[PDB]
Amino acid sequence: AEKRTLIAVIADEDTTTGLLLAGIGQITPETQEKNFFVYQEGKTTKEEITDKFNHFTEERDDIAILLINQHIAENIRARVDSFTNAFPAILEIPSKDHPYDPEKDSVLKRVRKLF
Amino acid sequence: MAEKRTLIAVIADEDTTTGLLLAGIGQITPETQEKNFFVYQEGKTTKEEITDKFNHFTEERDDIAILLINQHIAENIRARVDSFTNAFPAILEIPSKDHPYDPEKDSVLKRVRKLFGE
Amino acid sequence: QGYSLLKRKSEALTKRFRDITKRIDDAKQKMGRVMQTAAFSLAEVSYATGENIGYQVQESVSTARFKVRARQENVSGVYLSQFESYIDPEINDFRLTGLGRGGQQVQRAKEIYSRAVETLVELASLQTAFIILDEVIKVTNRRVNAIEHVIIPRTENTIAYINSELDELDREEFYRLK
Amino acid sequence: EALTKRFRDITKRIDDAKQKMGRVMQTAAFSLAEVSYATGENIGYQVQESVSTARFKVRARQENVSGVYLSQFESYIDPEINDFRLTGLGRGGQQVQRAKEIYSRAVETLVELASLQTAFIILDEVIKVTNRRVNAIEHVIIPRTENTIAYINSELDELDREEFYRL
Numbered sequence: 001a002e003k004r005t006l007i008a009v010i011a012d013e014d015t016t017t018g019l020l021l022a023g024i025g026q027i028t029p030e031t032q033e034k035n036f037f038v039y040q041e042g043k044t045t046k047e048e049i050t051d052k053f054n055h056f057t058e059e060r061d062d063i064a065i066l067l068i069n070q071h072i073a074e075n076i077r078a079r080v081d082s083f084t085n086a087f088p089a090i091l092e093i094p095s096k097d098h099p100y101d102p103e104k105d106s107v108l109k110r111v112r113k114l115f
Numbered sequence: 116m117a118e119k120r121t122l123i124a125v126i127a128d129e130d131t132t133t134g135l136l137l138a139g140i141g142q143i144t145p146e147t148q149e150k151n152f153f154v155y156q157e158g159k160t161t162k163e164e165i166t167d168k169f170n171h172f173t174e175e176r177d178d179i180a181i182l183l184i185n186q187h188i189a190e191n192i193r194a195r196v197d198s199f200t201n202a203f204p205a206i207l208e209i210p211s212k213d214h215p216y217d218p219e220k221d222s223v224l225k226r227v228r229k230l231f232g233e
Numbered sequence: 234q235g236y237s238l239l240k241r242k243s244e245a246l247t248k249r250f251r252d253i254t255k256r257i258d259d260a261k262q263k264m265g266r267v268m269q270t271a272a273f274s275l276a277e278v279s280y281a282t283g284e285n286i287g288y289q290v291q292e293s294v295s296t297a298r299f300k301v302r303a304r305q306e307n308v309s310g311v312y313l314s315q316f317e318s319y320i321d322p323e324i325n326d327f328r329l330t331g332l333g334r335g336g337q338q339v340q341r342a343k344e345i346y347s348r349a350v351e352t353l354v355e356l357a358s359l360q361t362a363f364i365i366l367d368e369v370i371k372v373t374n375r376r377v378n379a380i381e382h383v384i385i386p387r388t389e390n391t392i393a394y395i396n397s398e399l400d401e402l403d404r405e406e407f408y409r410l411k
Numbered sequence: 412e413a414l415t416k417r418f419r420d421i422t423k424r425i426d427d428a429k430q431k432m433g434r435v436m437q438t439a440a441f442s443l444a445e446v447s448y449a450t451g452e453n454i455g456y457q458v459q460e461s462v463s464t465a466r467f468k469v470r471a472r473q474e475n476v477s478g479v480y481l482s483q484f485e486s487y488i489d490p491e492i493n494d495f496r497l498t499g500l501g502r503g504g505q506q507v508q509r510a511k512e513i514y515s516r517a518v519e520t521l522v523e524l525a526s527l528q529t530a531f532i533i534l535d536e537v538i539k540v541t542n543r544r545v546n547a548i549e550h551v552i553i554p555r556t557e558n559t560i561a562y563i564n565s566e567l568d569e570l571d572r573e574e575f576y577r578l
Contacts, residue, residue, distance in 0.1 A: 001471040001482065007518075014440040017455045021495065021511045022518040023466025023488070025459075035465075064469045064484060065525040086482060086532050087471070089525040094433030096440075102426040111531040114235025114538065115418045121300045123350075130272045133287040137327065137343045138350040139298030139320070141291075150294070180303040180316060181357045202314045203303065205357040212272040215265035223251075223258045228367075230261050231360045235538040237415065242545050249553055256560045263567040270574045309547045345570060352566050355559060362556050369548055372478070376541055379477030384534065385417060387476070391527055392424045398520050399431040402513060406435065409509050410442045 004064040004087055008056040009036040010049065011069045012095055019067065035063065039072050046075055053079060056088065063088040070105065071098040081106045120180035120203055124172040125152040126165065127185045130212040135183065151179065155188050162191055169195060172204065179204040185211045186229060196232055206232035236380060243377050250370050257363065260356065267349055271342045278335035286339065289329050298324040299347070301354055313361040318354045428524065435517055439510045446503035454507065457497050466492040467515070469522055479537055484526045486519055 007024040009016055016038045019025070026035050037052045053076060056063050070092040073080045083090065083106075090107060094100035102108055123140040125132055132154050135141070142151050153168045169192060172179050186208040189196050199206065208229050210216070217226045279286045304315045332339060447454045469484045500507060 001473070004471050005468045005487070006465060007467070007469060007522075013455060015436065017443065017458055018436055018439055018510075018514045019518060020458050020462060022514040023492065023494070024468075024518060025462040026465040027463055029463075034462075064471055065522065067521065084532075086529055086536075089484070089529045089532075091521060091525050091528065093436075093521070094430065096437050100426065100429045100433060102422070102429075105429075107528045107532065108422065108425065110535065111528070112422055114535055115237065115415055117303050117305055120303045122297060123299070123301060123354075129287055131268070133275065133290050134268060134271060134342075134346045135350060136290045136294055138346040139324070139326070140300075140350065141294035142297040143295055151297075152294075154291070180301045181354065183353065202305065202312070202361065205314055205316070205360055207353060207357050207360070209353070210261075210265035210268065212269040215269045216262055217258075223255050226261065227254050227257045227363070230257065230356075231364060233364075235535065235542075236418075239538050239542055239545075242542060242549075246545055246549065246553075249549075249557070253553075253556055253560060256564060260560065260563050260567055263564070263571055267567060267570045267574065270571075309551055311552075345574065348566065348570055352563055352570075355563050355566075359556060359559050359563070362552055366548065366552060366556065369544065373541060373545060375478045376537065379479050380534070380538075381414060383477045384479070384481075384530070385414065385421075388421055388527065388530065389417065391523065392421055392428065395428050395520060395523050395527075396424060396431070398516070398523075399428060399435060402435045402516055402520075403431060403438075406438045406442075406513060410438065410506065410513075 001087070003061050006035050006063050008060075008063040008066045008088065009068070010039060010052055010056070010072055011036075011067060011093075012039050012041070012072075015067075015069060015093070015095060039069065049076055050079055057083055057085075057090075065089045065091060067091050067093060069093060069095040069098070070100055071095050073106070074104055077104070077106065081109075084110075116177075116203060119177050122151050122179050124176075124179040124182045124204065125184070126155060126168055126172070126188055127152070127183065127209075128155050128157075128188075128211050128213070131185055131209070149176075155185070166192055166195055173199060173201075173206075181205045181207060183207050183209055185209060185214075187211060187214055189229075189232070199232065208232060239377060243373050247370055247374065250366060253363070253366070257356075257359070260352075264349065264352070264356075267345070271345045271349070274338055274342050278332060278338045282332050282335045284329070284331045284335075286329065290327060293327055296324055297321065298326070299350060311361075311365050313365075314358070316354050316358045318351050425524075425527070428520075432517065432520065432524075435513070439513045439517075442506055442510050446500060446506045450500050450503045452497070452499045452503075454497065458495060461495050461497075464492050465489065466494070467518060479534070481533055482526075482529050484522050484529070486522045 006026060009019050016036055020036065049072060056066050064087065066088040068090065073092050092105050122142055125135050132152055136152065165188060172182050180203065182204045184206065189208045275286050298321055299318065300321060301316045301318050306313050306315050329336065329339060443454050466489055468487045468489060470487045472483050472485055474481050474483050497507060
């Protein structure tokens with residue numbers, strides 16, 4: 001818990017720009033690595049999303065919350081549903097052209113079950 | 116700890132003690148000349164003297180498995196009794212001939228708790 | 234099912250434990266009645282014969298006929314203390330003197346006290362179980378109340394609060410921007 | 412029952428909150444577009460370029476609530492790190508300032524939603540565990556205790572009976 005202080009992002013152009021403005025972004029100076037990955041609807045491959053998801057969720061010990069556009073998470077719902085650890089907390093948010101469906105949301109499903 | 120513990124010790128009044136001794140639980144340690152029972156008298160037995168015996172059967176002796184004690188007597192030293200938490204000796208608060216039943220004031224759970232040294 | 238399940242089991246369990254506790258209390262009372270009745274019959278004999286039973290009994294004590302054998306038993310994680318009475322046959326019974334006909338009354342009382350003591354050894358064995366069982370019930374009902382009477386309301390607030398923050402932000406955009 | 416409806420409402424209110432988040436954020440994004448278009452400057456480029464260390468972090472904290480332990484997030488804002496100084500916007504600079512204000516407050520809101528989801532996840536695991544204990548107890552110790560106490564009462568009934576033989 002104590003090591004987890006960053007908010008990571010997997011999201012489209014607009015969403016990412018907004019969050020970066022709020023000041024959540026960070027570059028590890030030695031590795032040149034980032035805590036955000038911009039997504040493009042035609043171009044970004046399912047395999048490439050899964051890499052980043054795994055990377056922020058399991059390969060890195062310092063992410064506290066992972067924000068992700070619901071539409072993007074929908075591409076890898078298998079992987080997202082299977083992830084159950086409390087950390088990082090995973091937050092699916094809507095994007096432009098893709099209104100938020102409650103019932104797709106993996107955390108929200110799990111919480112609905114067991115009410 | 117466990118394999119050495121074979122006696123039932125008693126801290127109780129005249130009547131209770133006589134009954135238990137009849138059942139055959141009493142013993143004199145031949146080397147130390149100690150007994151495993153202590154008769155109590157209202158008016159005469161001091162709170163300090165009860166605490167000595169309680170400590171003695173509970174912590175100073177390695178061979179007591181169960182300590183029987185009249186609830187009324189244990190009530191005099193409830194502080195000491197509640198604080199004792201080890202698995203052995205098992206502590207059992209019981210009635211006397213002068214006090215067969217519990218007060219109707221007491222809930223079932225309280226009565227049962229006291230029975231088991233709480 | 235989660236809460237809806239817990240709720241049901243929690244309750245089923247609390248009734249089972251209420252019954253156990255009641256039956257232990259019932260047993261405790263009978264112990265009292267059984268023992269005093271026996272004591273009264275020794276008094277009767279003592280009075281009738283002039284002999285002092287309490288004296289004779291206590292002064293003849295030497296080595297224990299009635300002992301126990303104490304075990305610790307692991308049961309589903311929790312360690313419990315169990316007891317089994319054992320009766321040394323090498324040791325003789327008391328041979329009380331000067332009772333005459335009253336001797337048989339005392340014999341029978343001794344028979345009773347022995348069986349009563351055996352019953353105490355079983356209650357003692359029951360103790361650790363009940364203590365653990367007591368704390369489990371208490372804890373379980375603490376969780377259920379927290380969820381019901383604290384955590385839920387507290388979350389209803391948090392989500393109301395969150396929506397108010399977002400309404401204000403929506404409002405501030407309508408004005409400050411366009 | 413009463414509780415299941417209250418919990419259904421929470422889930423509804425979470426959905427409502429999630430949608431507003433979407434609207435609030437896209438509106439802000441629109442206003443950056445407006446400025447980018449008007450000024451010719453590329454906001455996305457400049458923003459991303461000036462990232463180094465996070466101004467907005469969080470701190471995971473543990474809160475005991477009526478016995479059950481919950482993980483909460485608290486946003487921590489490093490004051491050592493400066494804000495962005497975007498260049499070539501002129502009048503448009505104030506529009507961007509205001510959007511930044513909004514995004515900051517929106518992100519704080521996401522930290523609170525994250526805490527809320529985390530709460531229910533933990534709460535889920537607590538219920539599971541608690542029901543595991545209850546079943547364990549109920550499988551052996553309860554029945555065993557119920558017998559022993561029944562047996563004990565029968566012994567005492569017989570002793571009571573054998574004493575009451577007195578006639």
